[PDB]
Design a protein around this ligand. Sequence first.
Ligand SMILES: */C(=C\C(=O)N1CCCC[C@@H](n2c(NC(=O)c3ccnc(C)c3)nc3cccc(C)c32)C1)CN(C)C
Length: 339
Amino acid sequence: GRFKILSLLGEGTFGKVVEAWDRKRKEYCAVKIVRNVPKYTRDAKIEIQFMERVRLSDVEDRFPLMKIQRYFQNETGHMCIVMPKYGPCLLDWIMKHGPFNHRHLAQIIFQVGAALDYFHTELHLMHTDLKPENILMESGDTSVDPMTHRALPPEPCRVRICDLGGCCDERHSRTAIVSTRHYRSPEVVLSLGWMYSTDLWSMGCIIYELYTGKLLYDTHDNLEHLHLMEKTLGRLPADWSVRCGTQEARDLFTAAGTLQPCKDPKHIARIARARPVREVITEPLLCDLILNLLHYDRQRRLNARQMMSHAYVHKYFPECRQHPNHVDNRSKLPPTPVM
Ligand SMILES: */C(=C\C(=O)N1CCCC[C@@H](n2c(NC(=O)c3ccnc(C)c3)nc3cccc(C)c32)C1)CN(C)C
């Protein structure tokens, strides 16, 4: 009727993202076509609801969050979310062109930070499912570095945070399980209590992957995940065995309170095969940024404002300080979250 399908941009379990022509509004768009199934149709209606709350408040698109244009339920019942056409996810870039250089990484960290502190302290929502697959480049345009001849992203490297289906609020289920496991914080795994700070754990795992091209935790099992945290970051806190909130979580510890060892030969090999982030990240400011996003203490862990205001971003993205989203170029902001 109004939207004519032009391209297939991507496909998955959720459904499809297509490029479409808006006949009444005279432009190209991306349309998310959700599979016409009761659980996804309702999670689309919930996902839609978080999307109108972002635009209606940020009416002049100050933060790099996705901005819905329109939506409808098709004549075949598929939920259809009309949005601007953005580019490919960060995962697509790192796999074709490799990791970003310090400047574009700093620019990416700045933008996601600005969006996340707006999410956390202005809307009081958590994303809970941030991953390189749903951080999209604003544009798919490419430039060539004259010295290295390698591909450079647009300057600045604008990105957009997507996939608001899993957004949570300030009294989500306390033992609720959030995040894709690769980017799932330990507080969620063992049900110790989680809030905004779990989005910052995911940023730590994403920033590691954007810089190394490798997942920090390529794991499918809670206990192997926890040993990898121990080998990449240091000992798990001693009190953790008394505070887990579900039976499943506490049975990963001794009667004494230490981690039970894995002996699946696949998990013994992988932990032996992981090396500490501190030896992989040679840049000391980038290392400190990643390590304190992966802090076991949810309150000493960096918040979104500290991440975007980190010394690493100030060194490699110095024009950070002339951006209208820089903290000192804004009025006094709501207080940052406590954990
Ligand atoms: C990377 C996944 C990825 O790049 N995308 C996730 C959804 C699939 C389509 C893809 N894509 C878009 N999408 C959008 O503009 C858009 C806007 C709003 N919401 C969504 C969900 C998507 N536009 C594109 C232009 C060029 C290339 C691509 C791929 C593209 C975004 C993971 N890899 C597929 C492995």
